[PDB]
Design a protein around this nucleic acid. Structure first.
Ligand SMILES: *CC[C@H](OP(*)(=O)O)[C@H](O)COP(=O)(O)O
Ligand SMILES: [Mn+2]
Ligand SMILES: [Mn+2]
Ligand SMILES: [Mn+2]
Ligand SMILES: [Mn+2]
Ligand SMILES: [Mn+2]
Ligand SMILES: [Mn+2]
Ligand SMILES: [Mn+2]
Ligand SMILES: [Mn+2]
Ligand SMILES: [Mn+2]
Ligand SMILES: [Mn+2]
Ligand SMILES: [Mn+2]
Length: 325
DNA sequence: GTCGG
DNA sequence: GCTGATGCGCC
DNA sequence: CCGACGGCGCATCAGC
């Protein structure tokens, strides 16, 4: 792991800023720094060298220098000693508990998994499912299991209506040998950007997946997005997070670009669009006017067309992952 | 925390 | 009810 | 207090 110490240091600062400081822009600055340094194909020797990379300024340069000399960072040492900061950071790793709820719980004397399990009545439904499956959701999914999960979802969606098309996106579509969860992009002809012909399009698929006891629990559910829990039939497999996103059929290419990721790739791509005078979301690419307001959607017949508009060399899903050297 | 302006 | 903001999450 | 930083779904509350 080339520059592993520096990238792990910056990831740890990132998590502190998001979870304790609630500084989401400092979080994203530390992650940018970590991603660019992790992609750099040379061992960094000084802070002055790293400063040449985009997202590495004076401050990050000065703690690369410190880390390289001492193999540690006083700031991070002091943060780890802070049992309050440690407990907040930990509680946010539970789904439904974010920086705000985590701080409220720690200030009311909930510092550990045991304390959390005793105070189950303080938790809403989401937080309760997040706690119940905390251990399971920490495990990654082997690709062999993702293929099992893909077979079940495709088959049940087909049985509801053959006109449905389900695409497993996220790290799976980027060709990862393990994934954190299963992300399913769903389309149907009856749902487009300008018309809803059929109601309950996402609900019908979730109900079928619940009927065959694949989906076991619901975190959140609306008209276009489902967030819940699934499990493979035993031959017990761990419980897995599943996201299902229903996208307008005429906006599939913008939808699949978003849901394929990575999260850092999307952020960088959408940031470059703004430089070139475009705004990208999961539905459309729109030009920004003189005002800075979004005009009419531009025509998209492929993922590559979106790249072409912002003058980016097309990257295959495999090349949209984060990498190390 | 970086960086454009 | 709608709009806006906060807090949770997705890539 | 230079101020933007990717963009948005779902859940809930505040103000109208
Ligand atoms: C990394 C050091 C900090 O950079 P940022 O603009 O989050 C500060 O320069 C020092 O942190 P403080 O000593 O806690 O103010
Ligand atoms: Mn490796
Ligand atoms: Mn590289
Ligand atoms: Mn620089
Ligand atoms: Mn959490
Ligand atoms: Mn207490
Ligand atoms: Mn209680
Ligand atoms: Mn995923
Ligand atoms: Mn997911
Ligand atoms: Mn650029
Ligand atoms: Mn993710
Ligand atoms: Mn500022």
């Amino acid at each position: 792991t080339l520059n592993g110490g520096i990238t792990d240091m910056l990831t740890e600062l990132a998590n502190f800023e998001k979870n304790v400081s609630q500084a989401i822009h400092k979080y994203n600055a530390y992650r940018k720094a970590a991603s660019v340094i992790a992609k750099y194909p040379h061992k960094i020797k000084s802070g002055a060298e790293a400063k040449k990379l985009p997202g590495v300024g004076t401050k990050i340069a000065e703690k690369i220098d410190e880390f390289l000399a001492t193999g540690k960072l006083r700031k991070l040492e002091k943060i780890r000693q802070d049992d309050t900061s440690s407990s907040i950071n930990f509680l946010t790793r539970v789904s439904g508990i974010g920086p705000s709820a985590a701080r409220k719980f720690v200030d009311e004397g909930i510092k550990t998994l045991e304390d959390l399990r005793k105070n189950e009545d303080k938790l809403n439904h989401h937080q309760r499912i997040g706690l119940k499956y905390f251990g399971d959701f920490e495990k990654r999914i082997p690709r062999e299991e993702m293929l099992q999960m893909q077979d079940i979802v495709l088959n049940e969606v087909k049985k509801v209506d053959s006109e449905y098309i389900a695409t497993v996106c996220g790290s799976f579509r980027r060709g990862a040998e393990s994934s954190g969860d299963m992300d399913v992009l769903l389309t149907h002809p009856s749902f487009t950007s300008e018309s809803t012909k059929q109601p309950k399009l996402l609900h019908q698929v979730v109900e079928q997946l619940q009927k065959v006891h694949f989906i076991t629990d619901t975190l959140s559910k609306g008209e276009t997005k489902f967030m819940g829990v699934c499990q493979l039939p035993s031959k017990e497999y761990p419980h897995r997070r599943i996201d299902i996103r229903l996208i307008p059929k005429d906006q599939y290419y913008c939808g699949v670009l978003y849901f394929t990721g990575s999260d850092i790739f999307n952020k960088n791509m959408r940031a470059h669009a703004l430089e070139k005078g475009f705004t990208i979301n999961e539905y459309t690419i729109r030009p920004l006017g003189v005002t800075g307001v979004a005009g009419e959607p531009l025509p998209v017949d492929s993922e590559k067309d979106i790249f072409d508009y912002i003058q980016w060399k097309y990257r295959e899903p495999k090349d949209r992952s984060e990498h190390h050297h």
